[PDB]
Amino acid sequence: QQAGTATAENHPPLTWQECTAPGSCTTQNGAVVLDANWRWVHDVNGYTNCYTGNTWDPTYCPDDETCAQNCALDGADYEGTYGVTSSGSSLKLNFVTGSNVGSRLYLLQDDSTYQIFKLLNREFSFDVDVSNLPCGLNGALYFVAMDADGGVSKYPNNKAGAKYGTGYCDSQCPRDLKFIDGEANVEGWQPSTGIGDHGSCCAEMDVWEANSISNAVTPHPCDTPGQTMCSGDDCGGTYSNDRYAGTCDPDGCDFNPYRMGNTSFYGPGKIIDTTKPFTVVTQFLTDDGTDTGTLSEIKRFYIQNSNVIPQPNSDISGVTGNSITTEFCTAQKQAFGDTDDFSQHGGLAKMGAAMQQGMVLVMSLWDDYAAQMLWLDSDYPTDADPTTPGIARGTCPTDSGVPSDVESQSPNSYVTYSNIKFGPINSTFT
Ligand SMILES: *[C@@H]1O[C@H](CO)[C@@H](O[C@@H]2O[C@H](CO)[C@@H](O)[C@H](O)[C@H]2NC(C)=O)[C@H](O)[C@H]1NC(C)=O
Ligand SMILES: *[C@@H]1O[C@H](CO)[C@@H](O)[C@H](O)[C@H]1NC(C)=O
């Protein structure tokens, strides 16, 4: 895709901090950029839609390649069209703005380059306010193995790049992306938004997926860490027919404290009381305590009112601990009767390989047209006994979360992420 000219692209500023030790942090002047898929795509020569509603305009987009040469991703009015505002070290995502629903943003090193995080033997921490996120919404902060330049050096027809939020991929191998690898997704485009023949896969570390009711932390490995194209139902993921047909783990190894049997830990009025802000800390430990080692454990702490509170232990029979490890992941898949696609695609060793490639920080607010976010905050397989281990993930009713409901009833929902800090283990807090 080309770079557009109707609207100029100005990235909202966002500061964060890199630390070397507790109390010793340096502020970085970052910025964020809106993902390519939320943008208006217009023809390079005038101001005409290449994409109209849920369909490609064949005059400009008769095939994948031509479309990409003829069409441009426009700049974004962040506040007014997409409901994104930044202040200093804080970023606010509004749910519904006019006819826009939600957003996905990446953190930039500079105006053409995603910030790369190498997470092994490091810790990542951020403050969050999810008090205005009801059932059916997902305020996500996570990492994917995208190219720093958004694909430009690999794909000559991508002239927009990171500056326009190109190059997305995650463990679902999404086929709803209008542009992949410097080509439009037009041949095979089946309207619902819509899905095409091509998808974009890469390893995904979901540090935080949450609303005011439930949260989960979930690594999702892929055979190839790092961005790959797939095609048809071989993609697997949410949009393909068979979830488990592809090269990535679509479920992942998850720790949601509610699902693990502690229902008094996280929620309104609870130990982590989601009516107020709190701090989320995630450590990525290696077997030998060094930066070159194998990923072996993911640990979680929360901080609310200067109190440091560790992730609760699993209270599921035969599943032990409060951290993600190979042992935990094996035991939890068995005790819930879920297919162990995690270990099939290389588990934590392969999550670690992706972390070694470097990963991009994504911040997001979305609702779920496929599954109503019930996998996160309700009884998920809905046709199943909510007393059997692993079905119940939160207190939301099973009729919650349908997009046309939440978009109409809670349009002023929002999420705020702030005070991002990154460094060696135990440097981001006391
Ligand atoms: C849910 O998790 C909480 C937090 O871990 C548990 O409360 C802790 O219990 C331990 C004993 O196992 C105490 O030493 C801590 O001081 C407790 N923390 C707080 C702040 O309460 C709680 O027991 C768990 N509840 C259930 C339902 O199992
Ligand atoms: C981090 O601090 C914790 C105690 O809060 C301790 O278990 C651990 O050894 C520390 N890690 C390092 C490498 O300093």
XYZ file of C-alpha atoms and ligand atoms in Angstrom:
472
model
C 0.000 0.000 0.000
C 0.936 3.586 -0.676
C 1.179 6.373 1.881
C -1.924 8.574 1.748
C -2.152 12.378 1.478
C -5.796 13.411 2.219
C -5.131 13.351 5.960
C -1.644 13.862 7.303
C -0.282 11.287 9.713
C 0.685 12.663 13.128
C 1.529 10.108 15.822
C 0.327 10.941 19.358
C 3.248 11.199 21.790
C 3.708 8.795 24.679
C 6.521 8.643 27.224
C 7.692 5.457 28.921
C 10.717 4.531 31.023
C 13.613 2.152 30.660
C 15.191 1.258 34.060
C 18.555 -0.229 35.115
C 17.665 -0.689 38.783
C 14.892 0.248 41.228
C 14.427 4.049 41.356
C 16.909 4.508 38.470
C 14.832 5.088 35.285
C 15.265 7.164 32.122
C 12.305 8.529 30.181
C 11.943 7.753 26.456
C 9.925 9.925 24.079
C 7.812 7.419 22.238
C 4.722 7.785 20.123
C 1.934 5.468 18.930
C 0.547 4.635 15.505
C -2.877 3.283 14.471
C -2.955 -0.125 12.797
C -3.397 -0.047 9.030
C -6.838 -1.812 9.115
C -8.703 1.029 10.852
C -7.613 3.516 8.180
C -9.466 4.853 5.160
C -7.933 3.355 2.000
C -8.153 5.689 -0.989
C -6.830 5.653 -4.539
C -3.481 7.388 -4.930
C -4.651 9.918 -7.577
C -7.949 11.268 -6.209
C -9.920 10.687 -3.027
C -11.945 7.559 -3.993
C -12.513 4.425 -1.889
C -10.577 1.345 -2.938
C -12.474 -0.320 -0.094
C -16.249 0.358 0.146
C -18.082 -1.014 3.181
C -17.152 -4.690 3.010
C -16.016 -4.955 -0.623
C -13.120 -4.109 -2.909
C -13.670 -1.683 -5.773
C -12.605 -3.682 -8.872
C -11.704 -0.645 -10.984
C -8.750 -0.006 -8.624
C -8.357 -3.464 -7.101
C -8.807 -6.133 -9.823
C -6.070 -8.194 -8.136
C -3.919 -8.294 -4.958
C -0.893 -6.555 -6.515
C -2.576 -3.810 -8.569
C -4.718 -2.829 -5.589
C -1.547 -2.294 -3.547
C 0.025 -0.093 -6.222
C -3.162 1.969 -6.707
C -4.303 2.369 -3.088
C -3.075 4.298 -0.105
C -3.552 4.169 3.639
C -4.741 7.563 4.802
C -3.538 9.430 7.885
C -5.719 9.286 11.021
C -7.497 11.878 13.103
C -6.658 10.119 16.379
C -8.791 12.072 18.851
C -11.778 12.905 16.694
C -12.241 9.786 14.563
C -10.698 6.972 16.644
C -11.042 8.240 20.198
C -7.318 7.920 20.997
C -5.750 10.592 23.261
C -2.382 10.710 25.036
C -1.339 13.004 27.843
C 2.165 12.384 29.112
C 3.037 8.828 30.017
C -0.637 7.881 29.637
C -2.736 6.649 26.666
C -6.563 6.586 26.609
C -8.572 4.385 24.234
C -12.273 5.136 23.880
C -14.551 2.350 22.712
C -17.057 3.928 20.263
C -16.377 7.230 18.437
C -18.955 8.047 15.769
C -19.017 4.890 13.669
C -15.521 3.758 14.725
C -15.292 0.823 17.121
C -12.084 0.488 19.134
C -8.472 0.593 18.010
C -5.077 -1.157 17.839
C -1.868 0.818 18.325
C 1.848 0.037 18.271
C 4.562 1.842 20.148
C 7.143 3.622 17.955
C 10.837 4.153 18.428
C 10.634 6.844 15.755
C 8.206 7.897 13.066
C 9.077 4.989 10.778
C 10.153 2.266 13.222
C 8.377 0.167 15.815
C 10.066 -0.051 19.209
C 11.578 -3.509 19.622
C 11.527 -5.131 23.064
C 13.766 -8.037 23.912
C 11.884 -9.540 26.811
C 14.093 -12.430 27.974
C 15.359 -11.955 31.518
C 13.431 -8.687 31.708
C 10.341 -7.339 33.348
C 7.562 -5.179 31.957
C 5.259 -3.115 34.053
C 2.367 -0.695 33.467
C -0.508 0.959 35.323
C -4.026 0.354 34.043
C -7.560 1.496 34.712
C -10.157 -1.066 33.546
C -12.985 0.245 35.798
C -14.951 1.409 32.708
C -14.618 -1.920 30.816
C -17.782 -4.086 31.283
C -18.499 -7.635 30.108
C -17.745 -8.255 26.465
C -14.799 -5.841 26.079
C -11.060 -6.617 25.980
C -8.470 -3.991 26.870
C -5.367 -5.739 25.622
C -1.688 -4.986 25.983
C 0.525 -7.589 24.266
C 3.628 -8.365 22.137
C 3.895 -9.819 18.626
C 6.902 -10.718 16.489
C 6.334 -8.009 13.822
C 9.115 -6.517 11.713
C 10.382 -3.226 13.168
C 9.914 -1.515 9.818
C 6.422 -2.912 9.238
C 7.533 -4.941 6.200
C 8.989 -2.240 4.010
C 12.432 -3.756 3.403
C 10.968 -7.140 2.389
C 8.048 -5.901 0.239
C 8.675 -3.127 -2.322
C 4.938 -2.384 -2.805
C 4.562 -1.509 0.860
C 5.571 2.127 0.773
C 3.601 3.071 3.926
C 5.323 0.949 6.587
C 5.381 1.393 10.335
C 4.480 5.031 9.905
C 0.975 3.841 8.884
C 0.781 0.784 11.119
C 1.502 -1.965 8.559
C 2.766 -5.472 9.138
C 0.414 -6.866 11.785
C 0.504 -10.542 12.704
C -0.532 -12.602 15.719
C -1.153 -16.230 16.722
C -4.645 -16.249 15.176
C -3.177 -15.783 11.691
C -5.792 -13.083 10.971
C -7.277 -13.117 7.501
C -9.245 -9.886 8.021
C -6.202 -7.749 7.136
C -6.659 -5.668 3.994
C -2.900 -5.586 3.316
C -0.342 -8.334 3.869
C 3.254 -8.506 2.589
C 2.796 -5.555 0.234
C -0.339 -6.923 -1.360
C -4.056 -6.342 -0.868
C -6.233 -9.241 0.309
C -8.688 -9.075 -2.629
C -8.662 -12.408 -4.454
C -10.710 -14.696 -2.203
C -12.234 -11.760 -0.278
C -15.485 -13.038 1.285
C -17.555 -10.200 2.904
C -19.078 -10.553 6.424
C -15.324 -6.260 7.730
C -14.485 -9.480 5.852
C -11.909 -12.267 5.457
C -9.576 -13.105 2.527
C -7.390 -16.007 1.381
C -4.248 -14.641 3.060
C -3.440 -14.407 6.778
C -0.477 -13.151 8.864
C 1.006 -15.365 11.571
C 3.460 -14.800 14.340
C 4.162 -15.638 17.942
C 2.172 -13.636 20.408
C 2.743 -12.974 24.140
C -0.554 -11.727 25.617
C 0.634 -9.960 28.738
C -2.797 -8.551 29.521
C -6.316 -9.230 28.297
C -8.849 -7.885 30.656
C -11.881 -5.967 31.601
C -13.223 -5.165 35.092
C -14.402 -8.783 35.580
C -11.565 -11.062 34.371
C -7.952 -11.089 33.064
C -5.613 -13.593 31.436
C -1.900 -13.831 30.612
C -1.220 -16.228 27.761
C 1.849 -17.030 25.610
C 0.997 -18.358 22.134
C 3.944 -19.962 20.242
C 4.286 -20.525 16.496
C 6.508 -22.916 14.481
C 8.151 -19.888 12.857
C 8.431 -17.104 15.433
C 8.038 -13.983 13.406
C 5.878 -12.900 10.564
C 4.750 -15.478 8.055
C 2.000 -15.537 5.444
C -0.548 -18.353 5.394
C -3.433 -19.186 3.031
C -6.963 -20.535 3.196
C -8.115 -22.782 6.013
C -4.427 -23.796 6.544
C -4.071 -20.529 8.526
C -6.006 -21.957 11.437
C -7.168 -19.474 14.044
C -10.470 -17.707 14.698
C -11.460 -17.212 11.009
C -10.510 -20.539 9.445
C -12.729 -23.640 9.742
C -10.381 -25.734 11.852
C -8.825 -23.683 14.666
C -5.923 -26.158 14.963
C -4.970 -26.562 11.286
C -2.206 -23.948 11.310
C 1.305 -23.305 12.532
C 0.343 -21.306 15.665
C -1.223 -22.125 19.014
C -4.577 -20.258 18.961
C -5.470 -21.007 22.610
C -2.124 -20.744 24.316
C -1.173 -21.574 27.879
C -3.347 -19.288 29.973
C -3.512 -18.070 33.515
C -6.796 -16.416 34.365
C -7.088 -16.494 38.175
C -10.877 -17.074 38.006
C -10.546 -20.011 35.647
C -7.827 -21.412 37.929
C -10.370 -21.455 40.741
C -9.797 -18.280 42.769
C -12.959 -16.258 42.335
C -12.242 -13.724 45.030
C -8.906 -12.443 43.636
C -9.771 -10.163 40.711
C -12.810 -8.011 40.085
C -14.929 -5.223 41.521
C -14.282 -4.913 45.256
C -11.936 -7.918 45.245
C -8.295 -8.303 46.354
C -7.327 -6.627 43.080
C -10.225 -4.180 43.079
C -10.950 -3.210 39.501
C -12.926 -0.052 40.398
C -9.544 1.624 40.930
C -6.236 1.721 39.027
C -3.534 -0.837 39.617
C -0.081 -1.790 38.365
C 0.605 -5.016 36.479
C 4.141 -6.490 36.536
C 5.277 -9.413 34.378
C 8.682 -11.066 34.551
C 10.170 -13.283 31.838
C 12.635 -15.655 33.526
C 15.200 -17.866 31.754
C 16.547 -21.257 33.057
C 20.077 -19.870 33.779
C 19.190 -16.297 34.835
C 20.759 -14.752 31.700
C 19.617 -12.988 28.530
C 20.681 -15.875 26.237
C 18.907 -18.669 28.128
C 15.677 -20.549 27.504
C 12.427 -18.993 28.666
C 11.352 -21.076 31.651
C 8.886 -19.094 33.764
C 6.504 -16.117 33.476
C 5.658 -14.473 36.820
C 3.043 -11.872 37.694
C 2.695 -9.305 40.525
C 0.089 -6.564 40.993
C 0.435 -3.344 42.976
C -2.557 -1.514 44.375
C -2.193 1.266 46.985
C 1.594 0.517 47.263
C 0.765 -3.125 48.330
C 2.615 -5.799 46.359
C 0.327 -8.786 45.710
C 1.453 -11.901 43.825
C -0.601 -13.891 41.407
C -2.794 -16.341 43.365
C -1.948 -20.046 43.319
C -3.984 -22.384 41.191
C -6.758 -24.020 43.179
C -7.450 -26.608 40.458
C -6.899 -30.263 41.473
C -3.486 -31.496 40.362
C -2.424 -28.132 38.902
C 0.008 -26.306 41.028
C 1.569 -22.843 41.355
C 1.043 -19.204 40.374
C 3.282 -18.925 37.332
C 3.487 -20.181 33.765
C 6.040 -22.993 33.326
C 6.150 -26.081 31.094
C 4.962 -28.098 34.086
C 2.008 -25.788 34.751
C 0.972 -25.701 31.088
C 1.037 -29.506 30.729
C -0.973 -30.049 33.926
C -3.599 -27.400 33.122
C -4.271 -28.688 29.591
C -4.775 -32.193 31.033
C -7.001 -31.158 33.910
C -9.266 -29.070 31.615
C -9.298 -31.587 28.767
C -8.091 -29.031 26.198
C -5.890 -30.049 23.278
C -2.236 -29.273 24.031
C -1.451 -27.239 20.926
C 0.924 -25.193 23.075
C 3.426 -28.020 23.369
C 2.853 -29.056 19.755
C 4.140 -25.647 18.592
C 7.169 -25.692 20.884
C 5.878 -24.288 24.161
C 7.960 -21.822 26.137
C 11.196 -22.664 24.241
C 9.551 -21.416 21.054
C 7.922 -18.453 22.811
C 11.499 -17.627 23.883
C 12.859 -17.887 20.328
C 10.329 -15.259 19.315
C 11.292 -13.061 22.250
C 14.930 -13.309 20.981
C 13.839 -12.029 17.576
C 12.438 -8.904 19.276
C 8.778 -8.026 19.662
C 6.421 -5.101 19.132
C 4.183 -3.562 21.852
C 0.475 -3.533 20.965
C -2.242 -1.702 22.870
C -5.817 -2.407 21.957
C -9.512 -2.129 22.745
C -11.873 -4.537 20.981
C -15.123 -6.436 21.124
C -15.523 -9.953 19.788
C -17.894 -10.780 16.912
C -17.006 -14.534 17.014
C -17.213 -15.536 20.690
C -18.545 -12.444 22.619
C -15.414 -12.448 24.863
C -16.999 -15.353 26.805
C -13.669 -17.265 26.771
C -12.376 -14.435 28.932
C -15.186 -13.474 31.303
C -18.054 -16.034 31.193
C -18.657 -19.811 30.971
C -17.068 -20.403 27.644
C -18.083 -23.500 25.784
C -21.667 -22.344 26.580
C -23.166 -25.801 26.033
C -21.288 -27.295 29.019
C -21.399 -27.711 32.779
C -20.088 -24.527 34.527
C -18.968 -26.681 37.518
C -16.423 -28.734 35.540
C -12.839 -27.373 35.773
C -12.001 -24.727 33.152
C -15.448 -23.693 31.906
C -15.973 -20.736 34.212
C -13.656 -17.759 33.549
C -15.717 -14.935 35.056
C -19.146 -13.854 36.339
C -20.561 -12.473 33.096
C -23.775 -14.045 31.794
C -23.592 -16.074 28.547
C -25.874 -13.647 26.735
C -23.338 -10.813 27.268
C -20.844 -9.321 24.879
C -22.663 -9.230 21.546
C -21.142 -6.249 19.650
C -24.423 -4.519 18.706
C -25.366 -4.553 22.421
C -22.132 -3.320 24.053
C -21.502 -0.723 21.292
C -24.972 0.724 21.910
C -25.089 0.446 25.737
C -21.516 1.232 26.705
C -20.088 3.511 23.939
C -18.143 5.627 26.491
C -16.278 2.608 27.805
C -12.536 3.128 27.729
C -9.168 1.849 28.901
C -6.181 3.850 30.138
C -2.608 2.531 30.089
C 0.093 4.570 31.782
C 3.536 4.609 33.376
C 5.069 1.943 31.184
C 8.395 0.725 32.544
C 10.845 -1.867 31.219
C 14.101 -3.253 32.599
C 15.963 -6.053 34.373
C 14.049 -8.172 36.896
C 13.080 -6.179 40.002
C 14.014 -2.792 38.457
C 10.481 -1.463 37.685
C 9.215 -1.579 41.264
C 10.179 -2.179 44.936
C -7.285 -16.383 46.431
O -5.987 -15.834 46.401
C -5.736 -14.979 47.504
C -4.465 -14.177 47.260
O -3.416 -15.085 47.039
C -5.630 -15.835 48.764
O -5.390 -15.038 49.907
C -4.064 -15.265 50.438
O -3.998 -16.463 51.172
C -2.709 -16.771 51.672
C -2.762 -18.193 52.224
O -2.767 -19.101 51.137
C -2.318 -15.707 52.710
O -1.065 -15.957 53.329
C -2.318 -14.342 52.022
O -2.059 -13.341 52.980
C -3.678 -14.104 51.349
N -3.741 -12.849 50.603
C -4.748 -11.986 50.780
C -4.415 -10.537 50.556
O -5.891 -12.328 51.121
C -6.941 -16.557 48.988
O -6.775 -17.529 49.995
C -7.453 -17.223 47.711
N -8.850 -17.520 47.958
C -9.400 -18.674 47.608
C -10.889 -18.604 47.334
O -8.748 -19.728 47.502
C 13.741 -10.315 42.576
O 13.226 -10.120 43.874
C 12.635 -11.289 44.426
C 12.060 -10.933 45.798
O 11.099 -9.905 45.661
C 13.575 -12.510 44.497
O 12.818 -13.708 44.611
C 14.495 -12.657 43.276
O 15.632 -13.430 43.640
C 14.915 -11.307 42.679
N 15.563 -11.528 41.391
C 16.783 -11.057 41.110
C 17.524 -11.734 39.987
O 17.301 -10.119 41.725
